[PDB]
Design an enzyme around this catalytic site. Sequence first.
Site, PDB file in Angstrom:
ATOM      1  N   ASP A   1      76.747  62.990  73.063  1.00 24.91           N
ATOM      2  CA  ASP A   1      76.258  62.126  72.210  1.00 24.91           C
ATOM      3  C   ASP A   1      75.537  63.208  71.358  1.00 24.91           C
ATOM      4  O   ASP A   1      74.175  63.754  71.975  1.00 24.91           O
ATOM      5  CB  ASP A   1      75.727  60.806  72.379  1.00 24.91           C
ATOM      6  CG  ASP A   1      74.399  60.485  71.443  1.00 24.91           C
ATOM      7  OD1 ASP A   1      73.315  60.722  72.206  1.00 24.91           O
ATOM      8  OD2 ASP A   1      74.293  60.040  70.435  1.00 24.91           O
TER       9      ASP A   1
ATOM     10  N   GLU B   1      81.494  39.906  74.218  1.00 18.62           N
ATOM     11  CA  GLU B   1      81.576  39.531  72.794  1.00 18.62           C
ATOM     12  C   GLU B   1      83.070  39.944  72.073  1.00 18.62           C
ATOM     13  O   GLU B   1      83.534  40.808  72.680  1.00 18.62           O
ATOM     14  CB  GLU B   1      80.411  39.839  71.947  1.00 18.62           C
ATOM     15  CG  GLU B   1      80.356  41.201  71.718  1.00 18.62           C
ATOM     16  CD  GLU B   1      80.764  41.652  70.263  1.00 18.62           C
ATOM     17  OE1 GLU B   1      80.792  40.887  69.436  1.00 18.62           O
ATOM     18  OE2 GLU B   1      81.083  42.895  70.177  1.00 18.62           O
TER      19      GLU B   1
HETATM   20  N1  LIG Z   1      71.728  37.944  65.863  1.00 18.39           N
HETATM   21  C1  LIG Z   1      72.791  37.484  66.365  1.00 18.39           C
HETATM   22  N2  LIG Z   1      73.091  36.454  67.244  1.00 18.39           N
HETATM   23  C2  LIG Z   1      74.377  36.216  67.600  1.00 18.39           C
HETATM   24  N3  LIG Z   1      75.502  37.307  67.269  1.00 18.39           N
HETATM   25  C3  LIG Z   1      75.222  38.439  66.888  1.00 18.39           C
HETATM   26  C4  LIG Z   1      73.946  38.490  66.051  1.00 18.39           C
HETATM   27  N4  LIG Z   1      73.952  39.778  65.669  1.00 18.39           N
HETATM   28  C5  LIG Z   1      75.196  40.315  65.489  1.00 18.39           C
HETATM   29  N5  LIG Z   1      75.880  39.312  66.480  1.00 18.39           N
HETATM   30  C6  LIG Z   1      77.361  39.732  67.005  1.00 18.39           C
HETATM   31  O1  LIG Z   1      77.248  40.511  67.795  1.00 18.39           O
HETATM   32  C7  LIG Z   1      78.232  41.717  67.813  1.00 18.39           C
HETATM   33  C8  LIG Z   1      77.650  42.833  66.904  1.00 18.39           C
HETATM   34  O2  LIG Z   1      77.042  42.839  65.660  1.00 18.39           O
HETATM   35  P1  LIG Z   1      77.903  43.881  64.592  1.00 18.39           P
HETATM   36  O3  LIG Z   1      77.363  43.854  63.177  1.00 18.39           O
HETATM   37  O4  LIG Z   1      79.145  44.080  64.880  1.00 18.39           O
HETATM   38  O5  LIG Z   1      77.013  45.334  65.343  1.00 18.39           O
HETATM   39  P2  LIG Z   1      77.366  46.718  64.498  1.00 18.39           P
HETATM   40  O6  LIG Z   1      75.971  47.150  64.561  1.00 18.39           O
HETATM   41  O7  LIG Z   1      77.854  46.437  63.459  1.00 18.39           O
HETATM   42  N6  LIG Z   1      78.339  47.274  65.857  1.00 18.39           N
HETATM   43  P3  LIG Z   1      78.866  48.872  65.510  1.00 18.39           P
HETATM   44  O8  LIG Z   1      79.540  48.810  64.064  1.00 18.39           O
HETATM   45  O9  LIG Z   1      79.592  49.226  66.716  1.00 18.39           O
HETATM   46  O10 LIG Z   1      77.523  49.724  65.281  1.00 18.39           O
HETATM   47  C9  LIG Z   1      79.291  41.008  66.949  1.00 18.39           C
HETATM   48  O11 LIG Z   1      79.890  40.308  67.741  1.00 18.39           O
HETATM   49  C10 LIG Z   1      78.537  40.158  66.144  1.00 18.39           C
HETATM   50  O12 LIG Z   1      79.116  38.806  65.459  1.00 18.39           O
END
Ligand SMILES: Nc1ncnc2c1ncn2[C@@H]1O[C@H](COP(=O)(O)OP(=O)(O)NP(=O)(O)O)[C@@H](O)[C@H]1O
Lengths: 255, 260
Positions: free
Chosen positions: B52, B164
């Site tokens: 990383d 998840e």
């Molecule tokens: N505040 C929250 N409460 C519950 N679930 C959440 C919350 N925020 C995000 N999620 C869920 O948790 C996971 C991660 O959110 P996500 O927007 O995919 O993070 P991300 O930064 O896009 N991941 P990455 O693209 O791998 O950096 C997904 O399943 C979301 O639906």
Amino acid sequence: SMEPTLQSILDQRSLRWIFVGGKGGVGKTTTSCSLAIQLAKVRRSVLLLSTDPAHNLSDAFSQKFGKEARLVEGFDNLYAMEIDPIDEAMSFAEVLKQVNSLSYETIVFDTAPTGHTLRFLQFPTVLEMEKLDSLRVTISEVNAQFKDERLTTFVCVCIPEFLSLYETERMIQELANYGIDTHCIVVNQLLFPKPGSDCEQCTARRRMQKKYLDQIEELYDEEFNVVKMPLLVEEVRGKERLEKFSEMLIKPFVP
Amino acid sequence: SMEPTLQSILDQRSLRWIFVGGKGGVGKTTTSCSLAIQLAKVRRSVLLLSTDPAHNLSDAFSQKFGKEARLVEGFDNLYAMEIDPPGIDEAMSFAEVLKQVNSLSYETIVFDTAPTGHTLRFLQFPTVLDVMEKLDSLRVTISEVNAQFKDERLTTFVCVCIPEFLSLYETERMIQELANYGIDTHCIVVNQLLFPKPGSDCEQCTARRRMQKKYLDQIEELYDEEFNVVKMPLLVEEVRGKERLEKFSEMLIKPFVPPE
Ligand SMILES: Nc1ncnc2c1ncn2[C@@H]1O[C@H](COP(=O)(O)OP(=O)(O)NP(=O)(O)O)[C@@H](O)[C@H]1O
Ligand SMILES: Nc1ncnc2c1ncn2[C@@H]1O[C@H](COP(=O)(O)OP(=O)(O)NP(=O)(O)O)[C@@H](O)[C@H]1O
Ligand SMILES: [Mg+2]
Ligand SMILES: [Mg+2]
Ligand SMILES: [Zn+2]
């Protein structure tokens, strides 16, 4: 101190490029999606553009997206596309130029962790026949675009754990060095225990996060909108749940 | 069914390259670290190698690492390093790192590497692929790498995920990729599991174990018989420092099981 909401992003209509950044996992997409839904509510049209080599834009909305923009089901105003861009970033620059010529009022970029983000920036400030000039020039422009605070900002997303905040500091600091504007932090996945509910884990957990939160505000309180999204029991997916979630971006959650 | 632990990794003594993979944030580093600590306990020496562009290894151990291997403070057996290898040459470079490293005396290497996207591209690479003597000397060392990835006595992947949607889905894709490439994999680590405390009634706590459990159930119904499915609990503090990481790693080898 500053309103703990993204109202200002809504209000600043010159904004053409809104980048969403943060460590892996913090909820970058969830946010990008939310944000565009909110903007789409008060703009002529909004494009949600994802660059993850894989794409979670479609997964987010349970709808197939592609390199071809399309209307997000349930909106008549919002569109999304999913693409794939010392020179793995010349191609990236072109997308923008071409996309910037499209008629979308506002663009919300969902992007691969600062690794490639931060690498793009690294670019202008590294480069220093007319096909030499011509390219560079074209960066020149883009670059000015980035540094134009009326046209571009970054939203930082993090959770209240060590590595995430740390990276958020570095990022804020890079953007500064590059002269790119940023004034919003979204602190996501906050566990708010339920009131009168005594839980060891629940309590102790809020205890540790709160020690981060406190610090986030003591530090960015005065030149960042510090939004605070609660951790939900289910993932945030589908038009419905994302819309609800997104409201909290604009008007503060407070239980 | 299969023991929910990484005992087999410790027992599988030919393993030379152990790759730790998974979506961003799931706990890839925390596991890499943990895993190496455990191996180091039953190998001549172990190298913990992170690519990383993030300095997360040092962050993990509150100790400055770098492109130069060094002894992790508090061990006399465990070393770590942090380096930086179309996207061709770079995958090309990635191979040089692998080769260079492989000729050192470290009995086992645990690679901390990025989200699916970043190793993959490279994997995709072989199949597709007085100075020219180097052009050649290259293909050659790519042969050898690709050979070794494909030798199950020498290489496996550990998949890390949380319960998840997006994480499991990526774990599926990865498992499937590794199969297509003929790279061995037989361990899933399901991390950050909320086990409510027994007798403790909590809306959130309860509901939350409810939704995760619906994922877990699926994970085992699907990989039960050809993966070790470990189950790490979500802890109240970050897992950092030698001490906390050690305690955590124990659960990798002895199943955590608190009354339901
Ligand atoms: N505040 C929250 N409460 C519950 N679930 C959440 C919350 N925020 C995000 N999620 C869920 O948790 C996971 C991660 O959110 P996500 O927007 O995919 O993070 P991300 O930064 O896009 N991941 P990455 O693209 O791998 O950096 C997904 O399943 C979301 O639906
Ligand atoms: N089971 C757990 N209980 C408590 N904290 C955890 C657990 N697993 C991971 N963490 C914390 O989660 C944060 C991220 O884990 P980490 O090993 O950095 O994930 P990662 O997959 O390596 N992130 P990235 O490399 O950006 O994809 C660190 O603060 C860890 O201390
Ligand atoms: Mg995302
Ligand atoms: Mg890591
Ligand atoms: Zn609880």
